[PDB]
């Protein structure tokens, strides 16, 4: 699968894509002309130090990978955690994060 390079495509997705959000996530998305969707994760430095940002990224990649069947195909998708998720990240359970992220991803059109 062609890799989604945020170093090359974040600006394009931000300028030409659409956006959805809830309490925990902003999701930016753009049709990619492919028969599959691709994930990028953009974590602001203030979310936490590297190990914490890496745990968030791991959770998001797991949610995406393990539930690819319900995610609309043909989009480049950028997931951005919000301040409220940073604040609750030490307490929140993975399954709640999963529910909130999949709620958004299923509404991509």
Swiss-Prot record:
Record keywords, A-Z: Endonuclease, Hydrolase, Nuclease, RNA-binding, tRNA processing
EC class (word): hydrolase
GO molecular function, one term: tRNA binding
GO biological process: tRNA 3'-end processing; tRNA 5'-leader removal
PROSITE patterns referenced in this protein's UniProt entry, alphabetically: RIBONUCLEASE_P (PS00648)
Source organism superkingdom: Bacteria
Entry EC no(s): 3.1.26.5
Gene Ontology cellular component terms for the protein in this record: ribonuclease P complex
Subunit-structure text: Consists of a catalytic RNA component (M1 or rnpB) and a protein subunit.
Protein family (similarity comment): Belongs to the RnpA family.
Full protein name: Ribonuclease P protein component
